[PDB]
Amino acid sequence: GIYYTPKIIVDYIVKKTLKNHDIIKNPYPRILDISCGCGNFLLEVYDILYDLFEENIYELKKKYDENYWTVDNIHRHILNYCIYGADIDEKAISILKDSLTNKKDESDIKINLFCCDSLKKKWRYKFDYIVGNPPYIGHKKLEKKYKKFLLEKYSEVYKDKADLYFCFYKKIIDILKQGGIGSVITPRYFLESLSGKDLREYIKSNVNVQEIVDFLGANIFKNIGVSSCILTFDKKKTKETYIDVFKIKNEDICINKFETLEELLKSSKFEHFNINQRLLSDEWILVNKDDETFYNKIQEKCKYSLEDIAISFQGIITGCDKAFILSKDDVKLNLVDDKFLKCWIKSKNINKYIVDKSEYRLIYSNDIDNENTNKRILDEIIGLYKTKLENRRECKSGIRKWYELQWGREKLFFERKKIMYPYKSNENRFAIDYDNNFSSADVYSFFIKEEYLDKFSYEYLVGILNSSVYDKYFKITAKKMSKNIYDYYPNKVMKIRIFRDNNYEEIENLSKQIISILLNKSIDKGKVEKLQIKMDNLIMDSLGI
DNA sequence: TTCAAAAAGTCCCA
DNA sequence: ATGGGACTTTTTGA
Ligand SMILES: OC[C@H]1O[C@@H](n2cnc3c(NCc4ccc(O)cc4)ncnc32)[C@H](O)[C@@H]1O
Ligand SMILES: [K+]
Ligand SMILES: [K+]
């Protein structure tokens, strides 16, 4: 439950908040970490503070009580008035307390360390500087009893599938003094995610965001599947409202390339651009001027969105795939009448323009009337996981029988011509499904509304949607998950805007040529790339880019 | 009644 | 052993 932040990032975060502190004007700064752990940040705060006091000790001695301000008194002063920490783990607090003590009995100095829940603590005062790495706990791994507390007391930032670190953002902001500075490393997903919409609104309207360091899919925490960003914000009265954005360019770099993180930020490994905080909508579109011009051209030119013209839906959720999904060559499928069997595909089966032939079959068990008529299917296939099936939420409440699919959706939505795409991918992969394929929630589908069929065809749509233009266009606002992975979920895919002009016929014809080649047995892959290049030129011409 | 979001992902191998 | 790559379930709030 304890995570170690890399030292190069700890040093950067502490420097970001304290490098320009006027210790002569205010020799009593309050620096807080509300998930301090063993003290990765606080122990570094001590070192920075000690040099700060020692470098100006005679100036403080002259300006203030000359007996109080001596070098031998710096250690006691820092612990009494400057360093504050909180963590739920008692053992970590005890270790940090020893570490701070060992920086030097005489007078039994008191240390401001609290073993508590930082989201419930009654904070008796606000703080000049707040740093640290909060806990990240999503909606599956958080206790329901605790989530009831969060939904009640942190509703301004925490609803639905929000994360625990949203609340730490709110708590840090609320107890930051006027003119104070906060700097934290959290997951990056709130920058684009639907869940973070309220959190983004809370940050934008309560603090000035100085800087966002976006590591994208780079691996900052070794052996941890998370993508990181560093946010620095303040409560200073400033007319200027511009954010420094540092966005990494190569996700494969090692974080220890230089001795300092700021060396990496200034280098060619990162790009820098500024964003006007006043121009942030509910979405934070953090791109350079070239991409903003590119994005705005497409938005203005396109009069339709996919949501306008299409019906979206998520795939089947069985609740226990091993009980219902079988290999098409499994001998146990001889027990299942073919009326119960559906073709089943995974996200990896989706390519551009077409789906691979399915290798798995879904038992649509919802169509099994009762347990007596098809006892063989229940006893020998589905019942092998009856205990796990009975633990599903809708089975415990009696809504579903133990052998039914948890979310079987509507069969008629899948058994039709439609477009399918993987839920997480490195690139746009929109395919026309001709084979009534079913899938789990790792594949999303949509079909065109009847009233828009004479304006848009499936062949045209997969043409533009798979183009290099729309690959770049979608990724401008897409949710970056891990290295070379973006979420392709309807909450953003359905916002993709599309156009219709004089190039419609040739774009559609090129797409049909690609599909015809891809479906050939002696498939000529090379010519497909040439046709794609020609289609990209038409699309770039159509959108004036 | 029933939708869709959510990576401190998960798992394997060189 | 670790770091990097291939691939992606079902729990959950609304
Ligand atoms: O690296 C993360 C670090 O933060 C610490 N930490 C995790 N959760 C909390 C916390 N409130 C949230 C909460 C949630 C559920 C609870 O049953 C109880 C409390 N309040 C303070 N510190 C917390 C950890 O111990 C790690 O040292
Ligand atoms: K004096
Ligand atoms: K990562």
Q: Which CATH number do you get for residue A231?
A: 3.40.50.150
Residues A326 and A234 in one domain: no
- Which atom in ligand 1 lies closest to the alpha carbon of residue A137? 14
Pocket probe mutation, ligand 1, options A36, A88, A145, max atoms within 8 Å of Cβ:
A88
Phi-psi region of A405 (alpha: psi -120 to 50; beta: other; left: phi over 0): beta
**Distance from CA(A189) to C1'(B14), angstroms, rounded:** 31
Residues A401 and A337 in one domain: yes
Nearest ligand to the C-alpha atom of residue A70: 2
Residue A58 assigned ligand-binding role: no
Residues A281 and A327 in one domain: no
Task: Give the integer Cα–Cα distance in Å for A381 and A333.
Answer: 9
Give A254-257's long-range contacts (Cβ < 8 A, gap of 24+). A255/A6, A255/A8, A255/A9, A255/A218, A255/A220, A256/A6, A256/A8
Residues A330 and A479 in one domain: yes
Q: A272 has which bridge partners? A: A246
Q: Collect residues with CB below 5 Å from ion ligand 2.
A: A 66
Q: A497: number of CA atoms within 13 Å, CB side? A: 15
Nucleotide nearest to A492 (CA to C1'): B5
Pocket probe mutation, ligand 1, options A116, A117, A119, max atoms within 8 Å of Cβ:
A117
Q: Which residue has the tokens 């700064």?
A: A29
Kindly state whether residue A301 falls inside one of the protein's structural domains. Answer: no
Judge contact between A216 and A478, C-beta under 8 A. Answer: no
Q: How far is the CA of A222 from the centre of ligand 3 (A)?
A: 9
Q: A487 has which bridge partners? A: A424
- Measured by CA distance, the residue closest to atom 26 of ligand 1 is A2
Cβ-count burial A376-392 (b if 16+ within 10 Å, e if not):
ebbeebbbebbeebeeb
Task: Give the integer Cα–Cα distance in Å for A133 and A385.
Answer: 40
Residues A193 and A258 in one domain: yes
Residue A5 assigned ligand-binding role: yes
In strand C, the nucleotides that come within 7 Å of a protein beta carbon are 2-14
| DSSP string across A142-156 | S-HHHHHHHHHHSTT
Report helix, strand or coil for A374.
coil
Task: Give the integer Cα–Cα distance in Å for A229 and A250.
Answer: 15
Residue where a domain stops, chosen among A118, A133, A148: A133
Residue A46 assigned ligand-binding role: no
Residue where a domain stops, chosen among A76, A99, A133: A133
Q: How was this structure determined?
A: X-ray
The tally of domains found in chain A comes to 3
Residues A108 and A183 in one domain: no
Q: How far is the CA of A501 from the centre of ligand 3 (A)?
A: 40
Kindly state whether residue A290 falls inside one of the protein's structural domains. Answer: no
Main-chain phi, psi angles of A267, to 5 degrees: -85, 180
**Annotated resolution, angstroms:** 2.3
Task: Give the integer Cα–Cα distance in Å for A363 and A198.
Answer: 40
Pairing relation of β-strands A83-87 and A31-33? parallel
Closest CA to A199 of A216, A211, A187: A187
Token reading at A457:
């065809």
Kindly state whether residue A393 falls inside one of the protein's structural domains. Answer: yes
Q: Which residue has the tokens 């396109």?
A: A302
Q: Which residues span the domain enclosing A2?
A: 1-133
Q: Which residue has the tokens 């973070």?
A: A196
**What does each C-alpha distance from A369 to A235, A312, A405, A409 come to in angstroms?**
63, 29, 13, 17
